[PDB]
């Protein structure tokens, strides 16, 4: 057996994996490893396909989607959620407290202590306005 081990998608998975490994190499849980690893990319405004900095929908709304699954068939999911930087973590809150969408996902997030934030970066807002011009 080759363990612990973590895989992630795309070249930004390289640096995400380093974060996940901080948990795994200390004997920590896979669930905690994968949540920390993807949060690093959610947090990064430069990564415009995940979380903060995400390119918005055609109306200028940054809507995020995420799901999580542990080692005993526990699942949580959020979709089309606004204003919350770390949708993986809301999903984990769904799983521990299975799928919420739209305003309701935000309402649950706020009830669990997450905070409203403006996820639209100046860069994303400007490229969205340029996209509209076409």
């Amino acid at each position: 057996t080759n363990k612990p081990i973590v895989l992630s998608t795309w070249n930004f998975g390289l640096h995400a994996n380093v974060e996940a490994w901080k948990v795994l190499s200390k004997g920590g849980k896979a669930l905690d490893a994968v949540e920390k690893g993807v949060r690093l990319v959610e947090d990064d405004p430069t990564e415009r396909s995940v979380g903060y900095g995400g390119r918005p929908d055609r109306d200028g709304r940054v809507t995020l989607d995420a799901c999580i699954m542990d080692e005993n068939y526990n699942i949580g999911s959020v979709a089309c959620m606004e204003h919350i930087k770390n949708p993986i973590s809301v999903a984990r809150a769904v799983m521990e407290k299975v799928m919420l969408v739209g305003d309701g996902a935000l309402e649950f997030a706020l009830s669990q202590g997450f905070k409203k934030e403006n996820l639209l970066t100046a860069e994303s807002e400007k490229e969205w306005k340029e996209w509209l011009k076409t």
């Binding site: 363990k3 612990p4 918005p56 809507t63 542990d70």
Partner: protein
């Protein structure tokens, strides 16, 4: 999108998938990333898989559930990802679409820590960290 799957020191699997979705999508558009058969699936008696690409095609094929059931049948993680990609290829053809217009990548892990990946088009890589270090690896692709 980023998908991430791990096997820990206890021998437990878990995974996560998070995205902002398609740029400039219609309001309320959801892809495969938050959907348990599709963007992510984990069965601790078998293995885990995560996907990225055109959300429409992963959803329509329930792709990670497929990859994990293939591992359940005896396929290696790499064989499982390949065969799942080959099913999307056949459906794209049956739909009369062009393969150049779709990208999907799967990555997979089994209980033993074996791992693998496959994708539609070249240009998708995945990152793998184990006790030998962190590596960027380039899997096989269907569209040659």
């Amino acid at each position: 999108t980023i998908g991430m799957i791990a096997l820990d020191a206890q021998g437990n699997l878990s995974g996560a998938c998070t995205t902002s979705g398609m740029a400039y999508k219609m309001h309320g558009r959801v892809g495969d990333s938050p959907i348990i058969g599709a963007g992510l699936f984990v069965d601790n008696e078998i293995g885990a898989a995560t996907a990225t690409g055109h959300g429409e095609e992963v959803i329509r094929t329930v792709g990670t559930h497929l990859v994990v059931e293939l591992m359940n049948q005896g396929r290696t993680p790499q064989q499982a990802c390949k065969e799942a990609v080959e099913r999307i290829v056949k459906i794209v053809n049956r739909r009369g679409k062009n393969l150049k217009d779709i990208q999907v990548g799967f990555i997979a892990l089994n209980k033993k820590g074996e791992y693998g990946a496959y994708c539609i088009q070249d240009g998708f890589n995945f990152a793998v960290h184990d006790q030998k270090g962190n590596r960027l690896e380039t899997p096989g692709f269907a569209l040659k």
